C-alpha cells in the first residue's frame, strides 16, 4: 500500500523533491507494476511550470511508464506476473517506485524493444502513430513535414519513415540538420526562418505534423501544404492559435486534432514499433537530476528525450 | 571446482544437427567473470560450423558467439565488472553461447549499454563490430562519401545503419527486389541497386567511393569493382567457403584495393557499443526458442530472416531431460 517518489511540493517553485505516499491495494482486476523507467514529456514540464490549475498539491509527474508486472489480481488474465509491461496514460504518475492500474490500462511491452528507449512510445509514440493512421497519412510516397524536432517530433520522423513517407523536418535549430537527416532518416531539412527556402517549398507537402507546444504562426506552414493537404495538430499549446481563414479555405486544406487514445491502437503501435525496431533517442538520468533536466527540457537542451531511471536511482528514504 | 553446464551442440559434424548437450566449464579464476546467458545471436560463422566448413573445429561443437548476459560471479581480482551487471562477450575470446552460462577473463567482458535492447543488441558483438571496425580502420567514416553495401543480410543491414550514422550516402546492392522498401525506408539507405539489372549496374559505374561486401557465398566482384571510383576501396567482410576470382584488370587500372576486415580489438568493441548506444543502433532481430535452432539454421542458409536470429536462452533453454 505504501509507495515513494519525487514530487513538486510547491506549485510556485516547480522543484521536485523526495516524497513518500501510499497506494491502493491490488484489487481483483488490478496489476502490480514495478517501475523501471519513466519518460519525461512536455505535459510533465508544463505541470511543473504551473500551467495546469486542476493539479493536486503534491504532484508526481511522468506519463511514459514502462515496468514489470509483479502481482496480478484474481480476475487478471491477459497480464502475468514477471511480464515486462507499459502503461498507456488512459492520481500518481510515473516518478515513483511502483504503481497500480486496471488490467485494461496495461499493454505488453514488446520483447524486441529497449524498455528505456521504448518508454516515450507510450505518450509520444502513440500520439504520432494515431494521428498518422487516423488521418490516412501512412501511405508510401506522401511528402510530409514534421514541425519541431523535439521529443514528439523525432518520434514522428521515425514512424513516418517506417510508413514509407518522404519526411521534411521544419525546425528553428540549424545545428540539428545532421540528426534529422542522418540520425533520424529525414529526407530533407527546412529552416523555418529561411523565407527563401520556405517559399521554394510552397505547396510541396501532402501533410504537416505540428508537434510544437508554443503558439507560433501556422499561416506560413499552411502555405507549405499542397491543395487538400492535412495539417495535423499534435502539440497542446497553453494559449490558442490564430487560424487565418484566407489560406485555409483557398486550398481545400484541413486542420485535424490528435485523437491519440485507443489503448488497443496503442498495442498496435507497440507491435509496429517492434517490427520496425523503433525507439526514442533517450537520455537516461537519475531522479536526483530531475530538476536540472526540467530546466534543460524547458530550454530544449536534450537530444529528444529525458527518461528517468527508476531502476537504480529512486532511493528509498524510509 | 568445475561447474556443470548445458546447451545445444552438434554431436555429429557430418549431419550438423544440434541437440541437448551437457558439459562442464572451468571454475571462476581470480580474473574470470561467470556470465548467465540471456541472448545469443546466430551469425554466418555459426552456420558454416554447422555445415562442417571448418576442418580444424573440434566436436561436440556448441556454437554461438554474439552473447549478452548478466554477470553472476567474479574473481577476487575483478573490479571493472560486478555481479548483476548486464555484460556482453567479445567474439574473439571451446563451448560457445548456445548454453545456459559461460566464463571468461575480465578483459574480454564488455559493459552492455543501458539504452540498447539485449536481444537487438546481441548481433552487435560480431556483425556490429565487423562493420564498425572495418569502416573505422579503412577511413570510410567521413560524412559525404558514397558507399555501397553488398548483401542485405545480418551483417549488411547493420553495416547500413552504422554507415548512415557515420553520415555516409549508402546504396544497397542486392539480388532481392522485395528488399527495396526495408533498405530505403526501414534502414535509411539512399538508394537500392539491383545487381542483376545491367542497366542499373552500368549506370552506376565509377560512382562509389567504397564498397562493403558482406556476402558469404561465392560471387563475382568485377562488376562491383566497376562501381568504384578511381582509388576506391572494396571492403571484404564476408567469409565465403570457396575462394574468389580477382580480376586483375579492373583492380590495377583503377588504383583500387580489396581490404580485409580484422574485426577484433575489444577496446574497439566497447567503442562500437557506446557508439551504438548514443545513436540508438540495434539489429532487426527474430527472437526464437533454442528448440527452433535447427529450423532457424536451415532458414538462415537461404537468408530467410529479417535480419538476425537471436536465441532467447534465458527463458527457453532447459537441461537434457534432467
Curated annotation (Swiss-Prot), chain B:
Effects seen without this gene: Strong accumulation of precondylocarpine acetate.
One Pfam family here: ADH_zinc_N
Effect upon mutating residue 45 to F: Abolished activity
Positions bearing carbohydrate: 100, 105
Protein's UniProt keywords contain Manganese: no
Family: Belongs to the zinc-containing alcohol dehydrogenase family.
Protein name: Dehydroprecondylocarpine acetate synthase
Gene behind this protein: DPAS
Amino acid at each position: 500500500i505504501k509507495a515513494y517518489g519525487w514530487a513538486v511540493k510547491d506549485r510556485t517553485t516547480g522543484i521536485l523533491s523526495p516524497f513518500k505516499f501510499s497506494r491502493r491495494a491490488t484489487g481483483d482486476d488490478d496489476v502490480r507494476i514495478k517501475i523501471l523507467y519513466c519518460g519525461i514529456c512536455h505535459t510533465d514540464l508544463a505541470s511543473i511550470k504551473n500551467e495546469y490549475e486542476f493539479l493536486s498539491y503534491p504532484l508526481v509527474p511522468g506519463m511514459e511508464i514502462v515496468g514489470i508486472a509483479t502481482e496480478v489480481g484474481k480476475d487478471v488474465t491477459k497480464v502475468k506476473v514477471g511480464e515486462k509491461v507499459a502503461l498507456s496514460a488512459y492520481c500518481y504518475g510515473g516518478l515513483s517506485n511502483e504503481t497500480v492500474a486496471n488490467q485494461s490500462f496495461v499493454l505488453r511491452f514488446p520483447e524486441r524493444l529497449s524498455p528505456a528507449g521504448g518508454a516515450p512510445l507510450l505518450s509520444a509514440g502513440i500520439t504520432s502513430f494515431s494521428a498518422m493512421r487516423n488521418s490516412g497519412i501512412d501511405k508510401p510516397g506522401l511528402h510530409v513535414g514534421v514541425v519541431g524536432l523535439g521529443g514528439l517530433g523525432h518520434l514522428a520522423v521515425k514512424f513516418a519513415k517506417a510508413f514509407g513517407l518522404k519526411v521534411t523536418v521544419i525546425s528553428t535549430t540549424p545545428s540539428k540538420k545532421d540528426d534529422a537527416i542522418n540520425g533520424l532518416g529525414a529526407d530533407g531539412f527546412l529552416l523555418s526562418r529561411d523565407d527563401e527556402q520556405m517559399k521554394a517549398a510552397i505547396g510541396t507537402l501532402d501533410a504537416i505534423i505540428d508537434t510544437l507546444a508554443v503558439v507560433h504562426p501556422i499561416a506560413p506552414l499552411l502555405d507549405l501544404l499542397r491543395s487538400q493537404g492535412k495539417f495535423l495538430l499534435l502539440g497542446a499549446p497553453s494559449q490558442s492559435l490564430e487560424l487565418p481563414p484566407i489560406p485555409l479555405l483557398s486550398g481545400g486544406k484541413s486542420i485535424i486534432g490528435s485523437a491519440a487514445g485507443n489503448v488497443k491502437q496503442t498495442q498496435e503501435m507497440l507491435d509496429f514499433a517492434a517490427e520496425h525496431d523503433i525507439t526514442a533517442n533517450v537520455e537516461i538520468i537519475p531522479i536526483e537530476y530531475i530538476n536540472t533536466a526540467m530546466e534543460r527540457l524547458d530550454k530544449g537542451d536534450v537530444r529528444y528525450r529525458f527518461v528517468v531511471d527508476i531502476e537504480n536511482t529512486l532511493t528509498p528514504p524510509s
